[PDB]
Structures are given as C-alpha cells and as structure tokens.
Amino acid sequence: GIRSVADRIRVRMARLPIEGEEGKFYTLVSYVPVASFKGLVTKTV
Amino acid sequence: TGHKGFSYKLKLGKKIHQNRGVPQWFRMKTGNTINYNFKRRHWNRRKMGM
C-alpha cells in the first residue's frame, strides 16, 4: 500500500546505452528479491 | 424539457439557427465592418429567457 514500504530493499541498477543516441546512457533499476538481508554487500554484477 | 409544444420547439430551433458567425465571404466585401456577430450567446453564458 501507500502507507508502508519494506524496511530494506535490494536493487540492481544497470547503466545501458540509449537506443536512439549512442552518446548518452540511461539507468535501469530492477528488483532483486532476497530471503534475508544478512551478510549482503554491494556487488558489481 | 423533453416535452414541448410544436410552436415552442420551432422557436427553439430558430435560436439555434441564429447562433452562427459571419461567413468568411461576407467578411471580404468592400467597406465591411461586420466581422463578429454581437448577438451571439452560449448556453452556459446567457439564458435566452424563453
């Protein structure tokens, strides 16, 4: 709902080239579901 | 109303017919000042009172 959000969220954002113009990039934030957030650090996939 | 007399309906239609602007060709006449119809009205602006 609108009144509550998860306490912690793990996301993966990937920088990809824009299809139209090759000079510029754009970010795509996606959702990575995990069972528990213990022992998870910032990983460059 | 949905229900109206015959004569009243015709006077409703005429008020519809008279709510038109100046045709473009009439506006091109020599020495013409009639560009806009100042007798115009719209349903939500002025009630024709009939």
């Binding site: - | 009243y8 006077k11 009172g49 009939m50």
Partner: protein, 72 residues
C-alpha cells in the same frame, strides 16, 4: 435563508410567450399579458409609460400595407 438558499426551487414559469405582442409577459394564472394587455381588444398603453409607447407603436415594424397607402 432568504438569499442564496431560497433560490433553489425557482423552476416554475410564471410568464410564457404572448401571442399578440410576442414577449414573455403572458401570466399563466392571471390569464392576461402584462405588456400588450391580451384578451383586451385595445393594446395596453399608458401615458406614464412614455418609453413603452416608443418601444412598440406605429412605425416600429414592417408597415407592410400602410407604407404603400401613405405614399399613395
């Protein structure tokens, strides 16, 4: 509630279009026209209403036949 609130029920016409003078002055319950005095044979005119005389009288209309006669 004598102002804004009381004007909610004004949806019943008192006057409708007259037949002799063409104005919305035909009183429905009184069965008379307040302007041209219909049923009455004589057109309703008053000397205190000098403007109402010049608004509707001879020469304020088409004069379909009189214009030929007077010029004749």
């Amino acid at each position: 509630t004598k102002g804004t609130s009381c004007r909610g029920t004004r949806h019943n016409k008192t006057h409708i279009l007259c037949k002799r003078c063409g104005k919305r002055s035909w009183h429905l319950q009184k069965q008379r026209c307040a302007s041209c005095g219909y049923p009455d044979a004589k057109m309703r005119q008053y000397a205190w209403g000098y403007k109402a005389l010049r608004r509707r009288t001879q020469g304020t209309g088409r004069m379909r036949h009189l214009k030929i006669a007077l010029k004749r």
